[PDB]
Ligand binder design. Structure first.
Ligand SMILES: [Mg+2]
Ligand SMILES: [Zn+2]
Lengths: 49, 1089, 98, 142, 52, 95, 48
């Protein structure tokens, strides 16, 4: 939801995500920058970090 | 002959020009003098046409006058405007931020119908700003400009529109008065013909016909022959128009008591009276010239119209099928065409006069409402003119316009040409034009009617490529605003000396020839078939007598800045555009050197720009100096001229004027006396002539970069002075008051050692970042807040200007003092700085080479600048090459060998070119210049040096040596003299850096801009280009501990300065904001782990 | 002594591929402009007709390493669309070799 | 539809409120200017309006009054709360003091700039710089 | 059914407005001279119309 | 920190709001022209929304940065830094 | 246009062989930006 809420008709997204208690797991890198976290790529992913 | 102080500038031109370049900025002055009914314009108008030449203010004060309340008992009326003498001169206004204006007077009269009285007195309506001899209004110390504005002309405009579903061409209509009933007729998607009045719901069109008091019989009489009639005639509508009118009304103002009289009055008032219908004379004339209405008859008062509305539907119908002509029963015959939106017969020019007229109209409307109130509320016998007038609205409107309006622009005061183009600039964007919709490709393009009215080349390169042009040279403006270009009449095939200033509505109807169409003598042509233009810009090879008109010169369509580029026609429109737009951003230099190879339009461009100080009456120089000159005219008087030395322009550049005369020298009115910033003896000099080689050096002119010689840094050739104006204000506050003192809290004396006993630096000082220009003190006992020189500035002071409220100065409200320091820097050419010729050959210096290592001719002459080969052909700026060759010739003159006989290539050459000395200026006009054959046999002559040798071949090339290796160069190399410019794109104004400085306080981000010690923007594309690598710690950095993280940044700085290893980020501020903004919506974002 | 071996990133807007950003080792030149190797002027679409450039300093050691290794100018020779070199002789070098 | 929605809850005490959250002030720009003129936006008079209506209700229940007007004022309070959360869902929305509507919390994350369509627009960083460029032919790629 | 089309067109407008906001602006350019740019020749709404 | 792994979103039972907040709001007075100071127990207030300037009270008792974390029994605000006015919300509680 | 430009940048263009060479120039100097815009659009999508 962090990513699709960077897209349009957000309120629908946030609503549908709240009811289900959606819990984004931060698998992408379109969102790990929003959080100021290390993208999972390169000198990111556990295998190297 | 033409100009007295004209340094001999030989001309390669062959044709005879029957028209001198009109006043290049006469449009502004003419429009103003029309706005104030000045006497010169009076004689102009009377000598030509009308004999009751109303002004532009009187029109306003009259269309309004008389004025009365609804009861009509008491009325009022203005008349007889009039102007006083200015309160202050120009520089006298600059030196103290005053304004250039003149007291304005009036002569109003009050009357009462029951008493039949008259009280006529003269009133005062404030201080009216005024125009100088240049064309610039001054506004609060600054020199300003009010540019023109392209707009559509009021009048019928038709346009076919294809329904994207059913591809059936259906025409339309639109009556577009200056204001009032906004309307559009059309052929509806059905055979019927509906209307749309007030830009609203549609209705039949026969409805409005029988609304005016008409019947179906007369309709089917004057027109009943098109099918569309029946469709809209078969409505089975009540022939007595009593409801459909009321229906229209109830659509206008739903909720009205119904009455036939109501709709009658509404229709006769909103479409046929000045209340909400006025086709200003331009529009009534656009509707007269079309439809052939009231032919050969005055146009004063027919704005409202009952017949200009009826023939429009006839035009529309007869155009439906395509009836290719019309005739009003009493008018003239005109064709049935469609109307383009860009065609200048349909566009027009809101000159400054008209803008000011309109703002004054608005102010007077506000005053009108004020006096309406005061007059239907106040008791008679106590109100007379001085009591029935509140002026503040008028002054406030004028000042609002001159301050805010995007047309009231600062003067582009880099160099005379910049300012002279800011005038004559046609701006299709502003209040009243287009800003959002047509910013496409239908107005940002060229049109065949731009020939002699706008330069298709000169147009800014920023967001306004096409919305901003530049009026041409041989052009003027109709009183109506329609642009006009001259044309030589021609009949039977013999040209004439007559000249007619035509507009596109009078040129598309005819056949115009070309300038170079040769003529043997007496006016007769030379061929039987020539080239011509036509209606739709369709050039043609056609007969020699069919023609009806003829051009007046080449360079008729080009602007000024484009008429100064030699060998232009050998370039490409894009590079000439670049050159035009790169002469305006050229900085004045200490010594201005005239252009060796130039174009004739280089003297007028400085005579007609207001940066040369000329005489006014033939006489004798009596006293000379650097600042002041004292003439002794031959009439008995003594004119005194004052030169402005070291005056900061509106962009940072200097304005040093220097005199070109001595004592006793005779002069002649119009003869230059003192040069300006960028002039030498009276002709525009923006840059310098430089010895040029064209060759790839050892990798320093790579990719448009270029090289120079340290000589241009020793002899101060491309040196330029730049002046900066810093200032502060002393005012009051809560904790007391602000003061300007030398007493500074708890500092050393090294700082103050440059200041004086008052707080301001001693003139002649040498300052730099960290230097106190003026010592101010702010309470709380006090605060250390003085003025200080920013980062990157330095130089010597010139002037300290202190304006004090204690000594009667019109300072602001919350102010006690105003302090302005001027500093100056003598900047030299350096790596990174920008250079450019006149053909878009631009480049940033990449090296500056010791003269001892520059390729030198056998005579030792060390080449100054070195260009590159790989930039000329792939860009089509070959003109410089020619500019190069001719230059060399103009430097080492020639003597054609006529001893035998004038070679065939020197046949067309005119005399005075068969010989010339060394360092001799030249002039190769744009489209009548030195062809390639009169130049590829001129290089031959190329007089030798003192030692008898020619340092150049018959091809333009020399055999250069190398300064490093010593060995010669194998092949011959090009060499010459090219005229380059220095631009305002200096590194010292472009470099910028930051480690830790000021932040936003709102988003908690480093600020943006060198102006405020800002930071660089790491957008999204960069985020991507990083992710693609696999860099995730660098991105974390550039997003957390460099922009937002409020503790991370400081902990990082501190760890660094301590040597420690820096920590990891925390949580940014943007995410925090996101979370405490979501929580506002009652959404619980609960992090996990 | 505080600038040796410490790399810096160079960007030119617009940025249209990972080679629009590159790490260089800085030397010191008395001036106000930023020199630049003439082979990378393709990656950047940079010509010296008055263009500009932007610098960025890495601070952490991870970032210094990423510059030295992933984003250096000598380790980045080939365009990641075709495998064809992108820093090679273009205009005058070609004519000289020819 | 029923199944998706209900199974979503497979607690639903969120569709109605007897309390409300109020953001912190720094995120609502209302400052002063030299002279006595404010610098204010269209996202902060809404809490004031809602408190005004909750007050109009605070003296209409215990003070004693008929259910009719209490309930009408409750409807009005709800219509005013709808302005805090995206006023613009009833056609003509709440209009600002001068002429134009208000900016609501759902605008921060929905429209032109927002905070979701803006937290990726980039940044403005420290330890950086800008300058023109020239050609170093005497230089190695690194 | 004129309910969906509204949200469709508005989402497309917003996507194109983001596209435009994504490109560099004149306050951030690193070019020779200020030239023409997407943000002043076409609007998000036409940049949407011309992809449908 | 920034060891996060998941962001569970959902609705907030009205008590959660009360928990988020440090105080309520009871005064519909955004600011008073005078004093250049927002009202008390109102909007843009100074009781829940942090000490305005720096470790500051509205009374003027403990402006001493020496101490820290003391609420004022005359004006009710805690002297803390980082402009805590930004991370502080309040619960309106109607009926 | 069926009226070509029979003159080069060396032989020297005439006037009317030079007033028809501008149209396309301005057209292109405006089209460049729209091209960049459509490119940015495609790219942002492919990255999405
Ligand atoms: Mg460039
Ligand atoms: Zn206290």
């Amino acid at each position: 939801w962090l990513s699709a809420a960077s897209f349009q008709e957000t309120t629908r997204v946030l609503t549908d995500a709240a009811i289900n208690c959606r819990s984004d797991k931060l698998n992408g890198l379109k969102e790990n920058v929003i959080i100021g976290k290390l993208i999972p790529a390169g000198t990111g992913i556990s295998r190297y970090r | 002959n033409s100009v007295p102080g004209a340094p001999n500038r030989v001309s390669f031109a062959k044709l005879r020009e029957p028209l001198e370049v009109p006043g290049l900025l006469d449009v502004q002055t003419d429009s103003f003098e029309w706005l104030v009914g000045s006497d010169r314009w009076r004689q102009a108008a009377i000598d030509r046409g009308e004999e009751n030449p109303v002004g532009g203010l009187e029109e306003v004060l009259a269309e309004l006058s008389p004025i009365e309340d609804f009861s009509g008992s008491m009325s009022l009326s203005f008349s007889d405007p009039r102007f006083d003498e200015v309160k202050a001169s120009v520089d006298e206004c600059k030196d103290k931020d005053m304004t250039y204006a003149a007291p304005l007077f009036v002569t109003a009269e009050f009357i009462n119908n029951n008493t039949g009285e008259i009280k006529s007195q003269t009133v005062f309506m404030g201080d009216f700003p005024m125009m100088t001899e240049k064309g610039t209004f001054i506004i609060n110390g600054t020199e300003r400009v009010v540019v023109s504005q392209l707009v559509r002309s009021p009048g019928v405009y038709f346009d076919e529109t294809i329904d994207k579903s059913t591809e059936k061409t259906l025409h339309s209509v639109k009556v577009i008065p200056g204001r009032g009933a906004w309307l559009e007729f059309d052929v509806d998607k059905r055979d019927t013909v509906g209307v749309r009045i007030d830009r609203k719901r549609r209705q039949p069109v026969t409805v409005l016909l029988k609304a005016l008091g008409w019947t179906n019989e007369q309709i089917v009489e004057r027109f009943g022959f098109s099918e569309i009639m029946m469709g809209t005639l078969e409505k089975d509508t009540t022939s007595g128009t009593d409801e459909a009118l009321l229906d229209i009304y109830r659509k206008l103002r739903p909720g009205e008591p119904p009455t036939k009289e109501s709709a009658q009055t509404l229709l006769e008032n909103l479409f046929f009276k000045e209340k909400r219908y006025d086709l200003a004379r331009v529009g009534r004339y656009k509707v007269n010239k079309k439809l052939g209405l009231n032919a050969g008859k005055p146009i004063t008062s027919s704005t409202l119209t009952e017949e200009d509305v009826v023939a429009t539907i006839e035009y529309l119908v007869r155009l439906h099928e395509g009836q290719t002509s019309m005739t009003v029963p009493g008018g003239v015959e005109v064709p049935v065409e469609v109307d383009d939106i860009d065609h200048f017969g349909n566009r027009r020019l809101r000159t400054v006069g008209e803008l000011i007229q309109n703002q004054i109209r608005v102010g007077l409307s506000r005053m009108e409402r004020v006096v309406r109130e005061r007059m239907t509320t106040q008791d008679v016998e106590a109100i007379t003119p001085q009591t029935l007038i509140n002026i503040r609205p008028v002054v406030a409107a004028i000042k609002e316009f001159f301050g805010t309006s995007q047309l009231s622009q600062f003067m582009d005061q880099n160099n005379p040409l910049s300012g002279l183009t800011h005038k004559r600039r046609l701006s299709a964007l502003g209040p009243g034009g287009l800003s959002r919709e047509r910013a496409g490709l239908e107005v940002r393009d060229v049109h065949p009617s731009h020939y002699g009215r706008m330069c298709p080349i000169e147009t800014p390169e920023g967001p306004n490529i096409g919305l901003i042009g530049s009026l041409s040279v041989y052009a003027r403006v109709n009183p109506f605003g329609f642009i006009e270009t001259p044309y030589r009449k021609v009949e039977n095939g013999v040209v004439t000396d007559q000249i007619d200033y035509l507009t596109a509505d009078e040129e598309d109807r005819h056949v115009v020839a070309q300038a170079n169409s040769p003529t043997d003598e007496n006016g007769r042509f030379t061929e039987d078939r020539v080239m011509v233009r036509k209606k739709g810009g369709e050039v043609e090879f056609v007969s020699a007598d069919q023609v009806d008109y003829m051009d007046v010169s080449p360079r008729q369509m080009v602007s000024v800045a484009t008429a100064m580029i030699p060998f232009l026609e050998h370039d490409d429109a894009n590079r000439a555009l670049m050159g035009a737009n790169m002469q305006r951003q050229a900085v004045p230099l200490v010594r201005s050197e005239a252009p060796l190879v130039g174009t004739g339009m280089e003297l007028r461009a400085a005579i007609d720009a207001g940066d040369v100080v000329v005489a006014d009456k033939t006489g004798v120089i009596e006293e000379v100096s650097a600042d002041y000159i004292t003439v002794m005219a031959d009439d008995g008087t003594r004119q005194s001229y004052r030169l402005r030395k070291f005056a900061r322009s509106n962009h940072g550049t200097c304005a040093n004027q220097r005199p070109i005369v001595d004592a006793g020298q005779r002069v002649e009115a119009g003869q230059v006396i003192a040069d300006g910033p960028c002039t030498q003896n009276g002709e525009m000099a923006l840059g310098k002539n430089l010895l040029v080689a064209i060759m790839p050096w050892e990798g320093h002119n790579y990719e448009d970069a270029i090289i120079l010689s340290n000589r241009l840094v020793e002899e101060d050739v491309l040196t330029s002075i730049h002046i900066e104006e810093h200032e502060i204000d002393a005012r009051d506050t809560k904790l007391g008051a602000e003061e300007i003192t030398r007493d500074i809290p708890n500092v050393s004396d090294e700082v103050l050692a440059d200041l004086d006993e008052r707080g301001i630096v001693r003139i002649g000082a040498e300052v730099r970042d960290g230097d106190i220009l003026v010592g101010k003190v702010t309470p709380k006992e006090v605060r250390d807040t003085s003025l200080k020189v920013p980062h990157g500035e330095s130089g010597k002071v010139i002037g300290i200007r202190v304006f004090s409220r204690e000594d009667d100065d019109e300072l602001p409200a919350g102010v006690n003092e105003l302090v302005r320091v001027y500093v100056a820097q003598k900047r030299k050419i350096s790596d990174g700085d920008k250079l450019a010729g006149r053909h878009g050959n631009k480049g940033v210096i990449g090296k500056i080479l010791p003269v001892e290592d520059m390729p030198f001719l056998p005579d030792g002459t060390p080449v100054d600048i070195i260009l590159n080969t790989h930039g000329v052909p792939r860009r089509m700026n070959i003109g410089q090459i020619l500019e190069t060759h001719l230059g060399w010739v103009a430097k080492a003159g020639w003597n054609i060998d006529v001893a035998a006989g004038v070679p065939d290539w020197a046949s067309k050459l005119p005399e005075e070119l068969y010989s010339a000395p060394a360092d001799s200026t030249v002039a190769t006009p744009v489209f009548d210049g030195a062809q390639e054959g009169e130049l590829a046999g001129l290089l031959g002559s190329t007089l030798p040096n003192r030692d008898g040798e020619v340092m150049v071949d018959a091809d333009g090339k020399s055999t250069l040596f190398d300064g490093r290796s010593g060995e010669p160069f194998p092949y011959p190399v090009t060499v010459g003299y090219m005229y380059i410019l220095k631009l305002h794109h200096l590194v010292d104004d472009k470099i910028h850096a930051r480690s830790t400085g000021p932040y936003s306080m709102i988003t908690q981000q480093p600020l943006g801009g060198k102006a405020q010690f800002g930071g660089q923007r790491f957008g999204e594309m960069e985020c991507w280009a990083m992710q693609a690598y696999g860099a995730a710690y660098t991105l974390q950095e550039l997003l957390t501990i460099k922009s937002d993280d409020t503790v991370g940044r400081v902990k990082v700085y501190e760890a660094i300065v301590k040597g420690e290893n820096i920590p990891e980020p925390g949580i940014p501020e943007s995410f925090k904001v996101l979370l405490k903004e979501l929580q506002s919506l009652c959404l619980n974002v609960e992090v996990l782990s | 002594e505080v600038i040796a071996e410490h790399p810096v990133l160079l960007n030119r807007a617009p940025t249209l591929h990972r080679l629009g950003i590159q790490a260089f080792e800085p030397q010191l030149v008395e001036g106000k402009a930023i020199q630049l190797h003439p082979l990378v002027c393709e990656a950047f679409n940079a010509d010296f007709d008055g263009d500009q450039m932007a610098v960025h300093l890495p601070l952490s050691a991870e970032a210094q390493a990423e510059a030295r290794i992933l984003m250096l100018s000598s380790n980045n020779i080939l365009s990641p669309a075709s495998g064809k070199p992108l820093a090679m002789p273009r205009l005058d070098m070609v004519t000289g070799l020819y | 539809k029923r199944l998706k929605v209900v199974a979503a809850f497979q607690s639903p005490m969120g569709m109605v409120l007897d309390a409300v959250p109020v953001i912190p002030p720094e995120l609502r720009p209302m400052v002063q200017l030299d002279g006595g003129r404010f610098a204010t936006s269209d996202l902060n008079d809404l809490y004031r309006r809602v408190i005004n209506r909750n007050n109009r209700l605070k003296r209409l229940i215990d003070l004693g009054a008929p259910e009719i007007i209490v309930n009408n004022e409750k409807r009005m309070l709800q219509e005013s709360v709808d302005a805090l959360f995206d006023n613009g869902r009833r056609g003509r929305p709440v209009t600002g003091p001068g002429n134009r509507p208000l900016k609501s919390l759902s605008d921060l994350l929905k429209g032109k700039q927002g905070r979701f369509r803006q937290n990726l627009l980039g940044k403005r960083v420290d330890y950086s710089g800008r300058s023109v460029i020239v050609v170093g032919p005497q230089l190695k790629l690194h | 059914a004129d309910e969906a089309a509204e949200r469709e067109r508005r989402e497309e407008e917003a996507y194109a407005a983001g596209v435009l906001d994504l490109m560099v602006d004149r306050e951030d350019l690193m070019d020779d001279e200020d030239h023409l740019l997407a943000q002043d020749l076409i609007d998000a709404e036409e940049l949407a119309d011309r992809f449908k | 920190v920034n060891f996060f792994d998941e962001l569970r979103i959902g609705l907030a039972t009205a008590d959660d709001i009360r928990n988020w907040s440090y105080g309520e709001v009871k005064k519909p007075e955004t600011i008073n022209y005078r004093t250049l100071k927002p009202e008390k127990d109102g909007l843009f207030c100074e009781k829940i929304f942090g000490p305005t300037r720096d470790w500051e009270c509205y009374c003027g008792k403990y402006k001493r940065v020496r101490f820290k974390g003391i609420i004022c029994e005359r004006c009710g605000v805690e002297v803390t830094r980082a402009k805590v006015r930004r991370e502080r919300m309040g619960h309106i509680e109607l009926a | 246009i069926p009226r070509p430009i029979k003159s080069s940048f060396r032989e020297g263009l005439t006037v009317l062989e030079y007033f028809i060479n501008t149209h396309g120039a301005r057209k292109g100097l405006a089209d460049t930006a729209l091209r960049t815009a459509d490119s940015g659009y495609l790219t942002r999508r492919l990255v999405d």
